[PDB]
């Protein structure tokens, strides 16, 4: 719970192996548990380990090396739905429970057939705003907050239509300014050059 | 499904008014502890109880108090609440081995004045004609804006039934005014369906946003409608090609 938790929010391609290794301190520790926590939800146990060795559970594998003093977790066949904050816990001889650094796992979804484009969505009789949708881009793209203070942008999200075996990324941008047009909406972001803009 | 029970689940209060979040657990566990969670700080223990009438202050205990008269309950008392006690609280229970059972969490916001509480405005934006000819898929975008605190639940309903396939809601709200301590929030969600589905004028798309605001107990002197806990929606119907 201090410096040098391994830098960066771990990123992993869809379908690839994810390896989390955390070295610990108190030698008196001899029992470790893994917890998975989705963003605004509560943490939930997903793996227990007791002896110096390996333990398996479906796509998960948790390692414990008391010699080196490191607890690890491996997730095989990574799905985007695995994207969460993983954190290990232990019971030390002091009677108290300890939660070490919690790592953020980001499994980038595999976008089979990318079609980068920004569409302007129809106004609502009810609302005055205009909304621009930047969709179908590949997971190699990162969206950035807008430069203007009164044009809102939401980081990319992944939606899946089970029926069609289709996943698509997307980011929204809106504003009530007249300045605002879908062509300037995402300028502060490195979008593919092949990016489509209708009419 | 036995679990730790936290009541209330959401709460807004004025600096000062004391409050107590209770925590129940029907699993006969002797161990219980409170945790607060903030962005960039992770989970931080506040207090913990190893057994009845046994109490010990965790890492960040100033401002909080607990009691363990019974094995089942381990309440959290804040005598004089403060803006920095605004956070996501969790209660946990531990028994066999040493595995933690977390309550669903409590979202507490301590604000200088209840005049800051606003409900969301919800609007639905229909699919682009461009996206339909180019993609043959239609994406609706629901926008929930100007709400405070950031306590919302959003969901899509098509023809009266909830929908999950093809929706993506932001994992967390956006601070409309990052630089403001009392900024209002925004949230967006996506609903994508085949272009065929969208063109049927008989199809009904409704966006549902549940806001957790004031209780019908809270006083209110302002002109605008009292920002109470409530559900706000917005819809659109299919449009023929």
> Read out DSSP for A133-147?
EEES--TT------S
Q: How many CA atoms lie within 13 A of B239 on its CB side?
A: 12
Q: How many of the other CB atoms lie within 10 Å of CB of A67?
A: 7
CB atoms within 10 A of CB B208: 19
A-chain residue closest to B36, CA distance = A42
Query: What is the torsional sign of CA A65, A68, A72, A77?
Result: negative
Residue with tokens 């107990």: B217
Contact A161 B192 (CB under 8 A): yes
The verdict on B51 and B63 lying in the same domain is yes
Same domain, A13 and A105: yes
Distance, CA of A185 to CA of A172 (rounded, Å): 9
Residues facing B101 on adjacent strands: B93
**Sequence-separated (6 or more) residues with CB below 8 Å from residue B62:** none
How many Å lie between the alpha carbon of B160 and the closest alpha carbon of chain A? 19
Do B42 and B94 lie in one domain? The reply is yes
Same domain, A83 and A93: yes
A42 vs B90, B171, B194: nearest CB: B90
B151, two tokens: 């306590």
Question: Which CATH number fits the domain that encloses residue B174?
Answer: 2.60.40.10
What's the gap in Å between the CA of B98 and the closest CA on chain A? 7
- Three-class secondary structure of residue B175 per DSSP: strand
Residue-number span of the structural domain to which A152 is assigned? 110-199
* Backbone torsion region of residue A63, taken as left when φ is above 0, otherwise alpha when ψ lies between -120 and 50, otherwise beta: beta
**Cβ contact B42–A1 (<8 Å):** yes
The owner of tokens 């898929």 is B137
**Contact assignment for A42 to B102 by CB distance below 8 Å:** yes
Single residue among A74, A109, A144 that ends a domain in this structure: A109
Considering the domain architecture, whether residues A6 and A45 belong to the same structural domain is answered as yes
Q: Structural domain tally of chain B?
A: 2
* Both tokens assigned to A115: 């079609």
Same-domain status, B173 and B221:
yes
Domain co-membership, B87 together with B152? no
> Radius of gyration over alpha carbons of chain A, in Å?
22
Distance from the Cα of A68 to chain B's closest Cα (Å) equals 23
Q: Among all residues of chain B, which has the CA nearest to that of A136?
A: B135
A128: Cβ–Cβ under 8 A, 6 or more apart, which residues? A176
The residue among B112, B138, B160 that closes a domain is: B112
* CA distances to A126, B6, B21, B24, B32 from B90, in Å: 39, 8, 10, 12, 11
Q: How was this structure determined?
A: X-ray
Resolution in A: 2.5
B58 contacts: CB under 8 Å, gap ≥ 6? B33, B34, B44, B45, B46, B47, B48
Asked if residue A84 and residue A15 are part of one domain, the reply reads yes
B127 CB within 8 Å of a chain A CB: yes
Number of domains in chain A: 2
**Cβ neighbours of B1 (radius 10 Å):** 2
B166: distance to nearest CA of chain A, Å? 5
Boundaries of domain holding B146: 113-238
Q: Could you say which of B87, B112, B137 is where a domain stops?
A: B112
For residue B179, the chain A residue with the least C-alpha distance is: A149
A167 sits in which H/E element: strand A166-175
Cβ-defined contact of B143 to A172 (cutoff 8 Å) = yes
Among B121, B134, B188, select the one facing A172 at the smallest CB separation. Answer: B188
A76 and A124 belong to one structural domain: no
H/E segment holding residue B124: strand B121-125
């Amino acid at each position: 719970k201090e410096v040098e938790q391994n830098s960066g929010p771990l990123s992993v391609p869809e379908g690839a192996i994810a390896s989390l290794n955390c070295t610990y301190s108190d030698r008196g520790s001899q029992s470790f548990f893994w917890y998975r926590q989705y963003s605004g939800k509560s943490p939930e146990l997903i793996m227990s380990i007791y002896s110096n060795g390996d333990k398996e559970d479906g796509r998960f594998t948790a390692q414990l090396n008391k010699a080196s003093q490191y607890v690890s977790l491996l997730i095989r066949d990574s799905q985007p739905s695995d994207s969460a904050t993983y954190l290990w816990g232990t019971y030390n001889q002091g009677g108290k429970l300890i939660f070490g650094q919690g790592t953020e796992l980001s499994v980038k979804p595999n976008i089979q057939n990318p079609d980068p484009a920004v569409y302007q969505l129809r106004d609502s009789k009810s609302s005055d705003k205009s909304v621009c949708l930047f969709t179908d881009f590949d997971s190699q793209t990162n969206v950035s907050q807008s430069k203007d203070s009164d044009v809102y942008i939401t980081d990319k999200c992944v939606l899946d239509m089970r029926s069609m075996d289709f996943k698509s990324n997307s980011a929204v941008a809106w504003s009530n300014k007249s300045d605002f047009a879908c062509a300037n909406a995402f300028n502060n972001s490195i979008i593919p050059e092949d990016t489509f803009f209708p009419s | 499904e036995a679990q730790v029970t936290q009541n209330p689940r959401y709460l807004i209060t004025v600096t000062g008014k004391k409050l107590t979040v209770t925590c129940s657990q029907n699993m006969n566990h002797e161990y219980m502890s409170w945790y607060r969670q903030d962005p960039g700080l992770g989970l931080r223990q506040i207090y913990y109880s190893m057994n009845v009438e046994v109490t010990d202050k965790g890492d960040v205990p100033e401002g909080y108090k607990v009691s363990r008269k019974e094995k089942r309950n381990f309440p959290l008392i804040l005598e004089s609440p403060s803006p920095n006690q605004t956070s996501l609280y969790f209660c946990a229970s531990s028994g066999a081995s040493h595995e933690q059972y977390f309550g669903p969490g409590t979202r507490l916001t301590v604000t200088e004045d209840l005049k800051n509480v606003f409900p969301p405005e919800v609007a639905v934006f229909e699919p682009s004609e461009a996206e339909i000819s180019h993609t043959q898929k239609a994406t609706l975008v629901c926008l929930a804006t100007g709400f405070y605190p950031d306590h919302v639940e959003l969901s899509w309903w098509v023809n009266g039934k909830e929908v999950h396939s093809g929706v993506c809601t932001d994992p967390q709200p956006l601070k409309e005014q990052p630089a403001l301590n009392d900024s209002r929030y925004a949230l967006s969600s996506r609903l994508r369906v085949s272009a065929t589905f969208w063109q049927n004028p008989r199809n009904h798309f409704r966006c549902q946003v549940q806001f957790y605001g004031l209780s019908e107990n809270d006083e209110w002197t302002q002109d605008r409608a009292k920002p109470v806990t409530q559900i706000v929606s917005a819809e659109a119907w299919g449009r023929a090609d």
